[PDB]
Design an enzyme around this catalytic site. Structure first.
Site, mmCIF file in Angstrom:
data_model
loop_
_atom_site.group_PDB
_atom_site.id
_atom_site.type_symbol
_atom_site.label_atom_id
_atom_site.label_comp_id
_atom_site.label_asym_id
_atom_site.label_seq_id
_atom_site.Cartn_x
_atom_site.Cartn_y
_atom_site.Cartn_z
ATOM 1 N N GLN A 98 0.801 -1.259 -0.076
ATOM 2 C CA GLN A 98 -0.050 -0.048 0.033
ATOM 3 C C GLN A 98 0.897 1.312 0.027
ATOM 4 O O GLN A 98 1.564 1.605 0.747
ATOM 5 C CB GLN A 98 -0.915 0.118 1.050
ATOM 6 C CG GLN A 98 -1.848 1.088 0.999
ATOM 7 C CD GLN A 98 -2.765 1.149 2.276
ATOM 8 O OE1 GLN A 98 -2.090 1.049 3.353
ATOM 9 N NE2 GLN A 98 -3.884 1.493 2.439
ATOM 10 N N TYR A 177 -4.925 12.270 3.141
ATOM 11 C CA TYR A 177 -3.679 12.311 2.671
ATOM 12 C C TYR A 177 -3.399 12.843 1.348
ATOM 13 O O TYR A 177 -4.369 13.576 0.754
ATOM 14 C CB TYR A 177 -2.898 11.076 2.821
ATOM 15 C CG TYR A 177 -2.854 10.316 4.143
ATOM 16 C CD1 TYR A 177 -3.677 9.098 4.478
ATOM 17 C CD2 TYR A 177 -2.288 10.929 5.140
ATOM 18 C CE1 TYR A 177 -3.690 8.719 5.536
ATOM 19 C CE2 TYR A 177 -2.021 10.324 6.421
ATOM 20 C CZ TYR A 177 -3.001 9.314 6.682
ATOM 21 O OH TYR A 177 -2.654 8.653 7.762
ATOM 22 N N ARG A 224 -7.552 2.993 -3.027
ATOM 23 C CA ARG A 224 -8.406 3.168 -1.867
ATOM 24 C C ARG A 224 -8.798 4.244 -1.697
ATOM 25 O O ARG A 224 -8.159 5.056 -1.954
ATOM 26 C CB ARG A 224 -7.636 2.571 -0.432
ATOM 27 C CG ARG A 224 -8.385 2.917 0.575
ATOM 28 C CD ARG A 224 -7.953 3.309 1.755
ATOM 29 N NE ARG A 224 -7.548 2.125 2.402
ATOM 30 C CZ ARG A 224 -7.426 1.757 3.572
ATOM 31 N NH1 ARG A 224 -7.507 2.486 4.523
ATOM 32 N NH2 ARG A 224 -7.073 0.387 3.838
ATOM 33 N N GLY A 315 -8.736 -5.035 10.354
ATOM 34 C CA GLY A 315 -7.370 -4.562 10.977
ATOM 35 C C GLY A 315 -7.240 -4.306 12.555
ATOM 36 O O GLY A 315 -7.410 -3.074 12.933
HETATM 37 HG HG LIG Z 1 -4.469 5.346 7.438
#
Ligand SMILES: [Hg+2]
Length: 315
Positions: A98, A177, A224, A315
């Site tokens: 990722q 991000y 994603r 997760g």
């Molecule tokens: Hg993250």
């Protein structure tokens, strides 16, 4: 009709089942962001899952602001991932790396430089640093040279992923991000090609995605996305204006699959899509759609059975 136990394919990736382990940032790599020997075991334990998405891994020091996170720009880094990745395969696993550019969500005391973003902004809150927490710094707006460099680091990052042995890559375009910053009108004030209309907020993503698919194949490439963000609280007014087109484009470009991260059902017994995103995205994106919510199994097994997604992330 499928269940979590049924096989699924992500391009050429023949996943044993429909579970996706997609770890939060463990943060157990060294100061040069080279993976460490513990990580081999951390990942090898999760090999039973249909597919593993790694902890988010830096494509560049500029973009890696999280202390002790790993990365994948360096030859050293590749060499470290190798055995980790091969551990997984040994156990008959699949794993995909990722790709992270944190954008404005970093501190120059860790990146060694000023935060970069689509526009010159300052994130709210504090940031983690090897010296503990601190006020976010303003960012500088990326220019053409920067973009070209950033795009470079993404392509190199993917290529390096394949060198280490990953079965593919996932472009992290989510959680406020760097790529997300471009997509959102509130984080993006540019007047160049990359700003203004929705079609332009999308350009940066397209250009990253394009390099990458050119580099290793749309069939080995996932993205994603996270329209309401990674966390309880937020709800995008009209996610169909940017995110759906984003998805439509990803379809057309050939992208193998799509994780869609969405802060998890609010009750225990509270609903799965609450925000009813998937049906909108399914309307345009036709390959496998992973839903990632913070999920009890029963919840997962539901959604999958209710047609909402093709596999589920944890997760
Ligand atoms: Hg993250």
């Amino acid at each position: 009709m499928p269940t979590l136990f049924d096989p699924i394919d992500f391009g050429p990736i023949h996943a044993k089942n429909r579970i996706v382990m997609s770890p939060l940032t463990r943060g157990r790599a060294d100061k040069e962001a080279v993976p460490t020997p513990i990580m081999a075991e951390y990942y090898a334990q999760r090999a039973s899952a249909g597919l593993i998405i790694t902890e988010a891994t830096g494509i560049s020091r500029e973009g890696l602001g999280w202390p002790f996170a790993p990365g994948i720009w360096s030859d050293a880094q590749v060499e470290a991932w190798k055995p980790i990745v091969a551990g997984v395969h040994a156990k008959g696993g699949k794993i995909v790396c990722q790709l992270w550019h944190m954008g404005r969500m970093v501190h120059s005391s860790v990146t060694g430089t000023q935060p970069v973003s689509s526009s010159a902004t300052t994130a709210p809150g504090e940031v983690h640093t090897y010296e503990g927490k601190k006020p976010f710094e303003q960012a500088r707006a990326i220019d053409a040279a920067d973009i070209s460099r950033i795009l470079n680091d993404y392509e190199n990052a993917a290529r390096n992923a394949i060198r280490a042995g990953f079965d593919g890559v996932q472009i992290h375009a989510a959680n406020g991000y760097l790529i997300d910053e471009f997509l959102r009108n509130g984080t993006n004030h540019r007047t160049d090609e990359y700003g203004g209309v929705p079609e332009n907020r999308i350009r940066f993503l397209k250009e990253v995605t394009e390099r990458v698919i050119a580099a290793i194949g749309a069939d080995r490439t996932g993205v994603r996305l996270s329209p309401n963000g990674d966390t309880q609280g937020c709800i995008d007014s009209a996610p169909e204006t940017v995110f759906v087109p984003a998805a439509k484009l990803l379809q057309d470009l050939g992208v193998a699959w799509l994780e869609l991260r969405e802060p998890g059902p609010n009750g225990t017994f509270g609903k799965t899509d609450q925000p009813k995103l998937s049906p909108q995205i399914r309307k345009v994106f036709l390959r496998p759609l992973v839903l990632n919510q913070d999920y009890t199994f029963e919840a997962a097994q539901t959604a999958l059975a209710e047609g909402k997604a093709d596999a589920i992330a944890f997760g």
